[PDB]
Design a binder for this molecule. Sequence first.
Ligand SMILES: [Cl-]
Ligand SMILES: [Cl-]
Ligand SMILES: [Cl-]
Ligand SMILES: [Cl-]
Ligand SMILES: [Cl-]
Ligand SMILES: [Cl-]
Length: 129
Amino acid sequence: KVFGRCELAAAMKRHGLDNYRGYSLGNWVCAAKFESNFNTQATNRNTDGSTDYGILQINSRWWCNDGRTPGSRNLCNIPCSALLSSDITASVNCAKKIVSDGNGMNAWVAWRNRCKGTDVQAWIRGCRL
Ligand SMILES: [Cl-]
Ligand SMILES: [Cl-]
Ligand SMILES: [Cl-]
Ligand SMILES: [Cl-]
Ligand SMILES: [Cl-]
Ligand SMILES: [Cl-]
């Protein structure tokens, strides 16, 4: 599913991402835009042989099982295929565990390089939330 900006904003707010660990909703929408272009079916292979899955490009090295990432872990206890659903629940529940892990949203390199320090409220402009 390719979400619209305000459809994703609304889905992330309902699932409790707005101000989760102090990250305002625009941070999460900005991250999704640059990780996946709001595409739930987005997959990207990393140099280390891990893969990133879904709207928030969650990595198979630590967080989900795809059965082809050596000496990986599955800390969110889910197959990486569950991160590609039209329903963002499994992505949101894994993102909450990632962002609690210690370095907050710096875990998403695209957030650090493209969103961090920018006017992220622009991402939720005109949205009926
Ligand atoms: Cl915001
Ligand atoms: Cl990740
Ligand atoms: Cl694996
Ligand atoms: Cl599995
Ligand atoms: Cl959803
Ligand atoms: Cl933080």
